[PDB]
């Protein structure tokens, strides 16, 4: 339910040019309702999200690139 409400708020932001203030709506886990996280003072460095996407994508791509595994038995 929360993600559906959270997604609905952000959907209106990208389709209604006069409702661009809804981009800041996130999650308020204390009361379990969406909340403007820019007003609430919930901030993260931009580098944290950007580097998370770049690193996770490359790591996921690396594993996705495998389709065959050969495990040599130990020499001992």
């Amino acid at each position: 339910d929360l993600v559906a409400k959270l997604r609905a708020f952000h959907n209106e932001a990208q389709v209604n040019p006069e409702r661009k203030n809804l981009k800041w709506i996130g999650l308020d886990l204390s009361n379990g309702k969406p909340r403007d996280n820019k007003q609430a003072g919930v901030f993260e460095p931009t580098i944290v999200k950007v580097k998370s996407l770049k690193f996770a994508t490359e790591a996921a791509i690396t594993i996705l690139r495998i389709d065959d595994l050969i495990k040599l038995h130990p020499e001992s």
């Binding site: 495998i66 065959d68 050969i70 040599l72 020499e75």
Partner: protein, 52 residues
């Protein structure tokens, strides 16, 4: 004339067949990693080293 050399020994034919079977097995093993749509392989050594 008719019949030629008997070729009593059968070992050379078996050796040739085994060599060909091994080569074909290797080729089929590495066929999947050919071309732009080929895919990598992950090889883990006895020491535990992992290479993709």
């Amino acid at each position: 004339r008719g019949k030629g050399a008997y070729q009593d020994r059968d070992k050379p034919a078996q050796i040739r067949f085994s060599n060909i079977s091994a080569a074909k097995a290797v080729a089929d093993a590495i066929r999947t990693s050919l071309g732009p749509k080929g895919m990598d392989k992950m090889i883990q050594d006895g020491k535990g080293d992992v290479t993709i």
